[PDB]
Design an enzyme around this catalytic site. Structure first.
Site, short mmCIF file in Angstrom:
data_model
loop_
_atom_site.label_atom_id
_atom_site.label_comp_id
_atom_site.label_asym_id
_atom_site.label_seq_id
_atom_site.Cartn_x
_atom_site.Cartn_y
_atom_site.Cartn_z
N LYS B 42 21.87 -4.66 13.98
CA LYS B 42 20.85 -4.27 12.71
C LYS B 42 21.79 -3.85 12.02
O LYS B 42 20.93 -3.92 10.78
CB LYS B 42 19.60 -3.11 13.88
CG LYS B 42 18.83 -3.98 14.73
CD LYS B 42 18.37 -5.00 14.89
CE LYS B 42 16.35 -5.35 14.76
NZ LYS B 42 16.24 -5.21 15.87
N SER B 272 18.52 -5.51 26.43
CA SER B 272 17.54 -7.33 25.88
C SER B 272 20.13 -8.32 25.97
O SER B 272 18.88 -8.72 25.81
CB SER B 272 17.51 -6.36 24.40
OG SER B 272 18.81 -6.36 23.73
#
Lengths: 309, 309
Positions: B42, B272
């Site tokens: 991110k 994830s």
């Protein structure tokens, strides 16, 4: 190509970032060791102690790793043991934090908890008993004296600093745990590159055992909160001969300095990272060091829950 | 040289590691996004959304950042705000974990806790009110629709995969949150490199909203434990046109697969990351995919305390 055959081989190539709220005119630059496989400087030595043990026949298929640690080096050995298919036992006291237990169980470690009352002594005994139980089975890699430890720093960490600065580094500041970092870095730059830099060791003022030794004064350690530095003795992997200068730092300052790294530089690093920087900042604010590039090892990544973030 | 003027500029160049206990004959390779400034994929978009907002005049000295998030993107924006000297407000519910609060306070965030009963809705309102209060002061960068988000993946993440594989990547597997990763990667390889690869999106079977849309069936999301994927809607930053294939995964499997990554590969990654791998492993074990290099985004680093390590 550039696909690592396993995670161990991806060690290093970590980055240099310039500090804005430390130093003078940007003479202080930091090397983020958080950016590693097991997220510390240590998995560099996790990788190469295993590789060396392989090359020289001490570690073989079936043979298992034993170590009385649970810090960055345990985590590091774990990831390489998982990566290379070794069974691993780490001993530690039963008083360790559920956090560290959970992290290490996750990496497929056999966790042998020793008596809490025996402190760290007792984990070292229990490791050592398992080794006597069968010396063809279990191997202790011994970070404090294993040359493979400083050897990796001579071969990777050191060259990387040389490369990314273009031969312009003047000063290297590195907290001392095993001494592996400073020793290896300094050998690379001074001996393989031939640059007469200032290597600075960093230690807790609460346990100034490098400072005391060199002054010829009673070695007297004590407790400190600077995790992973200040062992309370001179390690074999500390080469006193390449140390130019010794800077002591206090816990509070190491803490505060790591806090500042977060909120003012946006660098999440550990207590020892703070210690390292406060020492560098001090040097960097002396006119004799004005026009000199100072490079600091930030050993770890901040993501913890105990004093700090 | 190679000294980053700030931490934001050090994003990416993350590694490719080959999996040993997944795939067939090593056709499954993983790209460790844990190895970043704020330790996630991110902060690549943390960096470039701020940079883009600068270049186009929307973000200026004095102006402040506001965002209704506390996940990887909040942490990411925080580090860049700290790195570049922006004041930042992140809103989130008062029910957030002390852990995440502590981490974000550490990075110099102004934490505005919203009512817990208002869930995530209520943090979004409170952010949005602060923006209406003064539109010359506060800026919402909006990860779900901001093109800067997929643009960074086209410019860095994508090229890095191209480079390190030597044009040999055949398949890209990436869980979908904002869609930014898959979108940017796929544009780079398909359009800038001209290779007709198979881009595979990954989503929770519990919220198979990409699968439902493309089948022309009722979009029906639901809860899942796969943090950072399965938003419950199609984001603007998901370019449905570059998606070849959609693989759904269940929480338990994502969890178990991340556990396996630890103990069998020695790779600490997030839920994830597991989701991503189980999808790849499935594809990799199909004969139509036998002789094809499959690359998987592992979005995050494992160091947490809630289901897993």
């Amino acid at each position: 190509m550039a696909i690592y055959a396993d995670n161990s081989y991806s060690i290093g190539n970590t980055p240099l970032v310039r500090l804005k709220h430390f130093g003078h005119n940007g003479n202080v630059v930091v090397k983020i060791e958080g950016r590693n496989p097991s997220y510390s400087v240590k998995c560099r030595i996790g990788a190469n102690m295993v590789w060396q043990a392989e090359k020289d026949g001490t570690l073989t298929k079936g043979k298992e790793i034993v170590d009385a640690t649970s810090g960055n080096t345990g985590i590091a050995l774990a990831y390489v043991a998982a990566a290379r298919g070794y069974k691993i036992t780490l001993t530690m006291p039963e008083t360790m934090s559920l956090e560290r237990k959970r992290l290490l169980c996750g990496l497929g470690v056999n966790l042998v908890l020793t008596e809490g009352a025996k402190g760290m002594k007792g984990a070292i005994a229990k490791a050592e008993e398992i080794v006597a139980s069968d010396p063809s089975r279990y191997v202790m890699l011994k970070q404090f004296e294993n040359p493979a430890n400083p050897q990796i720093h001579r071969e990777t960490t050191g060259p990387e600093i040389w490369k990314d600065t273009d031969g312009k580094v003047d000063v290297v500041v590195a907290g001392v745990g095993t001494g592996g970092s400073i020793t290896g870095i300094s050998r690379a730059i001074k001996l393989d590159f031939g640059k007469q830099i200032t290597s600075v060791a960093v230690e807790p003022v609460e346990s100034p055992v490098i400072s005391q030794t060199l002054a010829g004064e009673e070695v007297k350690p004590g407790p400190h909160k600077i995790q992973g530095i200040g062992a309370g003795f001179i390690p074999k992997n500390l080469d006193l001969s390449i140390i130019d200068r010794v800077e002591t730092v206090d816990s509070d300052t190491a803490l505060a300095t790591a806090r500042r790294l977060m909120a003012e530089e946006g660098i999440l690093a550990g207590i020892s990272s703070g210690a390292a920087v406060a020492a560098a900042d001090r040097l960097a604010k002396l006119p004799e060091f004005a026009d000199k590039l100072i490079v600091v090892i930030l050993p770890s990544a901040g993501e913890r829950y105990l004093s700090t973030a």
